[PDB]
A paper describes a structure:
Connected to the head through a connector complex, the tail of a siphophage consists of three main components: a tail tube, a tape measure protein (TMP), and a distal tip. Using cryo-EM, we resolved the three-dimensional (3D) structures of the icosahedral head, head–tail complex and the tail tip of a laboratory-adapted fiberless mature T1 at resolutions of 3.5 Å, 3.6 Å, and 4.3 Å, respectively.
Furthermore, structural comparisons of the tail tip among T5, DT57C, Chi, lambda and T1 reveal that with the exception of the conserved and essential structural components of the inverted tip formed by the distal tail protein, hub, and central fiber protein, etc., a variety of add-on components diversify the inverted tip decorated with different lateral fibers, receptor-binding proteins or collars, etc. During infection, the tail tip penetrates the cell envelope. However, whether the tip of T1 is curved during the infection still needs to be further studied.
Numbering used by the authors:
A (entry chain A): 92 to 163
B (entry chain H): 2 to 117
C (entry chain J): 16 to 257
D (entry chain B): 921 to 956
E (entry chain S): 13 to 820
The structure:
Amino acid sequence: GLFQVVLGAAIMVAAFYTGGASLALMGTMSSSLFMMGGAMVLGGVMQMISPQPGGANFEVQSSKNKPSYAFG
Amino acid sequence: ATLDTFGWCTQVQGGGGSLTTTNSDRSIQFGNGYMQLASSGFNTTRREYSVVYAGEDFMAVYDFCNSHRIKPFAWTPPDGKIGIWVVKPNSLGAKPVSRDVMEINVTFMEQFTSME
Amino acid sequence: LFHNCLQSLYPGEIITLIEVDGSKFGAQVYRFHGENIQYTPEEIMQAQQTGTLPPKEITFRGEKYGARPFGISGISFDSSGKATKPQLTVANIDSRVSAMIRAYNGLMQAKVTIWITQRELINSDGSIADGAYRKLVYYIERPNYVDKSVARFDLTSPYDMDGIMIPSRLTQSVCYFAQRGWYKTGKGCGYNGQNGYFDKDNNPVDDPSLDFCPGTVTACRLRFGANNELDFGGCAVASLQR
Amino acid sequence: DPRGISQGVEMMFKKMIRESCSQGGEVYNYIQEKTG
Amino acid sequence: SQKPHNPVEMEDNLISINKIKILLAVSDGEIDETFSLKQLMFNSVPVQNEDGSFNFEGVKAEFRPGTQTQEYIKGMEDSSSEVTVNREVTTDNPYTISVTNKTLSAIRIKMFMPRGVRIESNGDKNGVRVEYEVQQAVDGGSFETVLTDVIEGKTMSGYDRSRRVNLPNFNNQVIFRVVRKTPDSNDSNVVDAIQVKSYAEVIDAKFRYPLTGLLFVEFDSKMFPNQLPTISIRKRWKIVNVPSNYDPESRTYNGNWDGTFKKAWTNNPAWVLYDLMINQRYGLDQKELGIAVDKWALYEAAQYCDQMVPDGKGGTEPRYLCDVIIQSQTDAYKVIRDICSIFRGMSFWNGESISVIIDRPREPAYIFTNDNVVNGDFSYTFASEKSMYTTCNVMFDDEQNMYQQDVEPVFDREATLRFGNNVTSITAIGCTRRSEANRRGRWILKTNLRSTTVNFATGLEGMIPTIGDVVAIADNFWSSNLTMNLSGRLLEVSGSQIFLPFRVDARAGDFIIVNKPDGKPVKRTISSVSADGKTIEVNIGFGFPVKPNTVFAIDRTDIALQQYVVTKIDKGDDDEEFTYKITAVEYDPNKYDEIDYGVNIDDRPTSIVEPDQIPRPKNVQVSSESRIVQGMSVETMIVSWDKVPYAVFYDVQWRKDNGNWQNVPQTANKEVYVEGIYAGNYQVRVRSVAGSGTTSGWSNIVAATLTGKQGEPGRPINLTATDDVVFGIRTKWGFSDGSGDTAYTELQQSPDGTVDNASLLSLIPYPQHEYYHSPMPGGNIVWYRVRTVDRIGNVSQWTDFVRGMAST
Ligand code: SF4
């Protein structure tokens, strides 16, 4: 059938289609939304295939050898 | 505070003049057919009316209706209980019957307190 | 077999069954079913003349199943690591489920299996081979909802690693052995009665019923003898002097 | 109409994030426990 | 190991002084006044240990309580000085101090030694010890001896020493006197003169720091060659608003608490919670608004907080005490909830109550039945499986390790038989005793197991009950199928009042329960039921009238009411308004008794470490030894001491008599041998050192004299030979015997008649000579000879016998 789309809000509109076809839209929406960029160091599919919480970690050996963000 | 009682008489035709009642009661059902009845305020019945008029001086009545939906007035349609009435928003329409007269439909609500 | 039936355009009726295991605590195993059972007019006339009405039971694999309505929520197998809890719904009319929950502390640690097969694949005596099946297993965690009508349960899997910190051999001063693997077992407890028995206040008793000695080094000093070897797990001086 | 529903949903979520990041919410308690 | 140091307080030699000043800030507000040296600590080591002795010797300090009308600390003397000049005498007591300026704070006196020496007949040089004092006067006083200073040593270029004196509060003027407390010398060769050449006086600093507690510590710089020690105190703290009929020390309750407040010290968290919620400087009403707090609930909390309950090793003790110190900024909600967690009492409301309710064995207050909720329906929900624990870990601030954290777990055996291991971790917020940590752990362990929440919604009845009121539930659903719960009735007091329920038979039980408009529900024994019509007659007597269509409930021994605790009440709008959502949790009437009797802890055992006072050497002896080389004599100096435990490496230091200490290099032999020490007087003292570096105190001065060559007796010279065969000369031979290689010379005496009264000295020959010829004789004249030996150290020898001579 004809598909007249609404530009303002597509997320809620897409679910209202009965069409015996909302399942594909739901699956695609979830899969695509999981990969959206944010503020995390590690990327996309590297998390979805086999997760690995990534981040540089340094042990502390002395208080006078740990720098900072230029306070003093 | 010069109030103006509604004029131009009244008539009943085409489902005009039927009253309407509005209440302000809240009730809760307990169980086993037990209910608790309560009312917030003073339990006043805001009566509503619908009026249809057709006559030669339709323009003056239309002017009155358009200019008196902000300030109230008095009008005693069925029984003589004087009331403080005000026209509802966007509830005024006109229908044509002849080149000289028109048909006008208006709805009235009863206001209490304020009176101005 | 069942794969071939599923791989066709017109499969037949499909059945789903649930059972709950509680024999670990001493709880009977329950079994439920639905699907509605039709009644023949001859049975109706027999019930009319004799004035009785027997409830309908149903015979699948093993022993028969009861007649209770139910429902199952979303089931997913995600490799992203997120753990999802499906929901159970069980109809409750005779309050038997509520009494079970009251008496048996909510039957939390229970084992549930879900069986899905096809009706005509089952022979007339309810015996089918292991060449084709569909088995799902979960564990109950909480009786989420209890009312006069519907009782609802949540399920998880051993993949839910909430809590469960890995290194737990903390340097304590109170008998880490007598927390997980308790007294009189050969793991860490070598105490074999020896010098009698003692109670919560380390009082000397003689019956084999009231026995309890938690943590304190004095307890064992007493159970094991003054100068004899000790099986205490943990150090007496937990931390150095400041 | 889906447009009004979407607008209400986004406004409600915007209020929810502030009511949860404030004193009492799950994120506040989690941060207090973790960072300390 | 422990930090090194060395106590140095016995300043008497030529040595300068260097001091360090540290001023510390103490908790805001008023504090107790008990500042004794037994409560001041260096590196978690007390300064003065009861009677004992001084661990860190020579420490000056003064303290303030922290009120508005304090007086400034006389430390941190700065802002230059004035300094006058004069040098008279310190023998016949001259010199005075006539300060008048009231702004003056302290006075510095500098004393001068021009020359200090002493000689003997032998020419050896020693030192001189002299004593002074400094005395105040005050208006009409006894001059109040203050400062005592000792000076010794051997000097040839001068010695300076400046001391510090602090003025007392006065009205008109203050007089200081300088006195000498030793006999004055004479024209004999003993040099001792005292000169004072300073009037260094100055203000110090007028910074009294109002409203804050202070602490001023002074010590020397030589004592610490490494990182300075952390300073701490052990004493009471902030004065709290205590109720009137309350003695904090004895924990009494006179009765009839009337609201009047007093100021004292307490450890009850009930009263140091109210202090935080009301203070305007650093509390909760910061925006100058008087907030309302329920005093009666806090009084009941205080009464419950001091119940006597034993645990551990007997010895009943109060069940909740809190003494904490705050040093970092945290959110107010966190601090308030951490303090409230000691009670585990609820807190709620915003405007008119601000209240706290402790978990007590409370009584029911309101009845709810199937006819007092919406859609006659109750919902049941429970807790997640991960919330049921078996062990909890509790942090600490331990008393016997002196506020170092520790761990004490809490575990219940019964819960471990069904679930497994579920572990938590809760940081204690000030429990200084192990038993209360165990009680706190068992609190959560017991409450988490029992949680059967039941919720429902009601009508206008929600305005009556508040949070914390235990309510009773008579639900038909959970109570099998029998009901005995309606809202009928038809009479007030009439006596069994017919009590016809419009439906439902109901049956015979113990009591029927009614809801009074204001008071607690009243139960009366349902005897003489007479259920002939199955719905007639219940009770015996009743008080006050009862409205029709009122609620009731019936209970039995087999089936009874269920008690719950209300925690949350909610309200609706525009369709619900008069409804009130309510939730509740299962009530427990016996968990406190199980809590109060389920803890067992022995103690913290002692450990093996270095002691704070390393013992001094016990006894010391000084001897010598001798050897003969190159004609002269060589001595030795011998010292010894007992091997004292906890001591590796010793130290030896000695002078002549009084001049200047010199250090013998560090030795571990426990004995010291030094050769070639010249004759004179000597003294020796020996310290002790440990592996860490902490040196002990000084020993007892032991003095010895080295006369020479072990003492030893001389040996007489043998075989004096007199001959009678030499013409015109008389001669004599001899033999200096063994060990005579130190002979300075021989002594030759010649008598004429063998009488010792007629023996006179004749000559004195050199050591490398034994024979002597004396030519001026007459013929046949008889003479006699006597010969002895004198040594280099002028040690004589016993005379020999008299031999005869006969000239030719
Ligand atoms: S001291 Fe020994 S016997 Fe006692 S609990 Fe510990 S391991 Fe077991």
